[PDB]
From a paper:
Conjugative type 4 secretion systems depend on relaxases to process the DNA in preparation for transport. TraI from the well-studied conjugative plasmid pKM101 is one such relaxase. The relaxase binds this single-stranded oriT DNA via its N-terminal trans-esterase domain. This domain reacts with the DNA via a transesterification reaction at the specific nic-site, which generates the transfer intermediate consisting of the relaxase covalently bound to the 5′ end of the cleaved transfer strand (T-strand).
Author numbering: 1 to 260, 272 to 306
């Protein structure tokens, strides 16, 4: 699944949790959850973990002490800072990785994001002029900062990476200019399919059987069912939002509504909820069908 959110000066505070949302995550306790990616990042000498100060300079176009982008033509509130390409795993893949466990699933997801980012670079464009005419140029380079989180805002298992594409690309003349985002935005389905294809291949290498849905071109873990996942999500929402049954009297409804923080405690709730629905996360590795191959 891929969602694209444009980050502007107006909504920049929406990224405030890019680091803190990972605070108590299992697979980044002693390991990186961020990375620099893209040929543009290489050009800037950026690799490995994303240092927040450098992220913030590039967010506003400060490439170096002597190179400062100017991109806002008009209302500075509308200046685009970058594009959050949020890649989320299928829910059952998330449940497997975050309730049962296997760091290989996290690595598969990050390989799939990196493959989609490499493909996104082919869509990078910038504007320039020739003979006084505005023209478009294919630049083949992006600057991307990735942030991996394990949970949704509702504290569901929800493995996802925010692949933050900076609003910059390096032109042929060597100048850094705003990204002309048209081709990026209109290839959301292609980039999401690249992620899905690479995730499915990496999970197959690790011996997980996948079930395929042809109508939606999606897949999930084969050893528990869509109905089981949907029931898990329903029960999760009951607990998260404190939903109560209806009461025949105001007094009973009031009392039921009134009645209804460690990751370890949250994990136990996940595990207990899945057990009660008959989910068995102990899959028969390297057994079963290959439904997603050649899809
Ligand atoms: Cl097993
Ligand atoms: Mn997140």
């Amino acid at each position: 699944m891929l969602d694209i959110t444009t980050i502007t000066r107006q909504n920049v505070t929406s990224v405030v949790g890019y680091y803190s949302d990972a605070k108590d995550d299992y697979y980044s306790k002693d390991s990186s959850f961020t990375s620099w990616q893209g040929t543009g990042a290489e050009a800037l000498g950026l690799s490995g973990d994303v240092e927040s100060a450098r992220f913030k300079e590039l967010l506003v176009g400060e490439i170096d002490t002597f190179t400062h982008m100017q991109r806002h033509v008009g209302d500075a509130k509308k200046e685009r800072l970058g594009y959050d390409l949020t890649f989320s795993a299928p829910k059952g893949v998330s449940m497997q990785a975050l309730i049962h466990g296997d760091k290989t699933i996290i690595e598969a997801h990050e390989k799939a994001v990196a493959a989609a980012v490499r493909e996104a670079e082919k869509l990078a464009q910038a504007r320039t002029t020739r003979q006084g005419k505005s023209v478009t140029q294919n630049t083949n380079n992006l600057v991307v900062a990735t942030f991996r989180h394990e949970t949704s805002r509702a504290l569901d298992p929800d493995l996802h990476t925010h692949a933050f594409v900076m609003n910059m690309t390096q032109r042929e003349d060597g100048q850094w200019r705003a990204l002309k985002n048209d081709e990026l935005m209109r290839n959301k389905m292609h980039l999401g399919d690249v992620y899905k294809q690479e995730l499915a291949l990496e999970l197959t290498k690790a011996g997980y059987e996948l079930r395929y849905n042809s109508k939606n071109n999606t897949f999930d873990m084969a050893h528990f069912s869509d109905e089981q996942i949907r029931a898990f999500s329903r029960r999760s929402e009951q607990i998260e939002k404190g939903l109560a049954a209806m009461g025949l009297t105001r007094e009973t409804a009031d009392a039921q509504t009134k009645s209804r923080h460690s990751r370890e405690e949250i994990h136990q709730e996940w595990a207990s909820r899945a057990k009660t629905l008959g989910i068995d996360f102990d899959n028969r590795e390297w057994q079963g069908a290959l439904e997603v191959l050649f899809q």
